[PDB]
Design a protein around this ligand. Structure first.
Ligand SMILES: COc1n[nH]c2ncc(-c3cn(-c4c(F)ccc(NS(=O)(=O)c5cccc(Br)c5)c4F)nn3)cc12
Length: 297
């Protein structure tokens, strides 16, 4: 439980962009290291117990600020920014199959560590693309895996903007197993495949209702390779007990990379978004038309 002095940190821009949160890029002066600093109301003993987690695909704890009124958690800083910003920028057009396979595996291995390999079982419950960051060598690291433990509850305000990634049982505040994270991982994979914002522009509670009540799921383009479509469908099962573990997802991804025909099929699909983005936009339009109907009641 390394202690860092508030004065040993030269601050920089908040990392959140839209809905900034309380995370800043900073320089740890005495260690000559670039860091992230999450400002906190107070440090609790949960920060101490999670401070020993270490895995290449989770953000690395460095220390805590323990100087009232300045509290915070310090971690490494991933040079290449958030997964969400990458996907929703022109840079992601460079992605091919190999890139996706490696990044799908990165997140799966981080979640496997959190679920099965840490001294304490961590269920994220808020896995999403904005909670994954890209280090300088391209290794993805999961962030914010302790937040669902720090706060014991939710409100509509804190859920706004996150409904597309939430498993139905999480939306419902029903019993929760670790495979709620499998559902969210499916959305992140879909984001990488389609390079779109899931359910873009839709009322969060319409998304919740569509996913929870109607078994609605994100549109998978018809030309998406069957191996990806099938894995998405497995991740998105309404019944959490039918979703695969992350150990199973890892073995599935590994087998897909022995498939000699998949790279051409996937690369052709990935680079053909001008042709199939209309399938995703058609469903958005239909759900927007559905929203107009459900406004008149
Ligand atoms: C442009 O935005 C970025 N570009 N590059 C980046 N690199 C990194 C980050 C980043 C780091 N964090 C961060 C943090 F500072 C402190 C804690 C957590 N997660 S946690 O669950 O509370 C946790 C983690 C480890 C030990 C414990 Br104990 C607790 C945390 F995620 N948040 N964002 C953002 C960017």
């Amino acid at each position: 439980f390394v202690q860092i002095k508030f004065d040993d940190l030269q601050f920089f821009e908040n990392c959140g962009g839209g809905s900034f949160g309380s995370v800043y890029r900073a320089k740890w002066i005495s260690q000559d290291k670039e860091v992230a600093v999450k400002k906190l109301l107070k440090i609790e003993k949960e920060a101490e117990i999670l401070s020993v987690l270490s895995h290449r695909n989770i953000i690395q704890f460095y220390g805590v600020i323990l100087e009232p009124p300045n509290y915070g958690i310090v971690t490494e800083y991933a040079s290449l920014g958030s997964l969400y910003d990458y996907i929703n920028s022109n840079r992601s057009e460079e992605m091919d199959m190999d890139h996706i396979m490696t990044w799908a595996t990165d997140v799966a291995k981080g979640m496997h560590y959190l679920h099965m390999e840490a001294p304490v079982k961590v269920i994220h419950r808020d896995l999403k693309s904005r909670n994954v960051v890209i280090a300088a060598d391209g290794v993805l690291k999961i962030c914010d895996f302790g937040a669902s433990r720090f706060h014991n509850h939710t409100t509509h305000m804190s859920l706004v903007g996150t409904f597309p990634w939430m498993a139905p049982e999480v939306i419902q505040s029903l019993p929760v197993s670790e495979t709620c994270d499998t559902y969210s991982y499916g959305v992140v994979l879909w984001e990488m495949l389609t390079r779109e914002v899931p359910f873009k522009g839709l009322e969060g509670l319409q998304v919740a209702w569509l996913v929870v009540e109607k078994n609605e799921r994100l549109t998978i383009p018809s030309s998406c390779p069957r191996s990806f479509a099938e894995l998405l469908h497995q991740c998105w099962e309404a019944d959490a007990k039918k979703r695969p573990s992350f150990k199973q997802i890892i073995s599935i991804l590994e087998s897909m990379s022995n498939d000699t025909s998949l790279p051409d099929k996937c690369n052709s699909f990935l680079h053909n978004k001008a042709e199939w983005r209309c399938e995703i936009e058609a469903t958005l339009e239909r759900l927007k038309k559905l929203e107009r109907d459900l406004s008149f009641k």
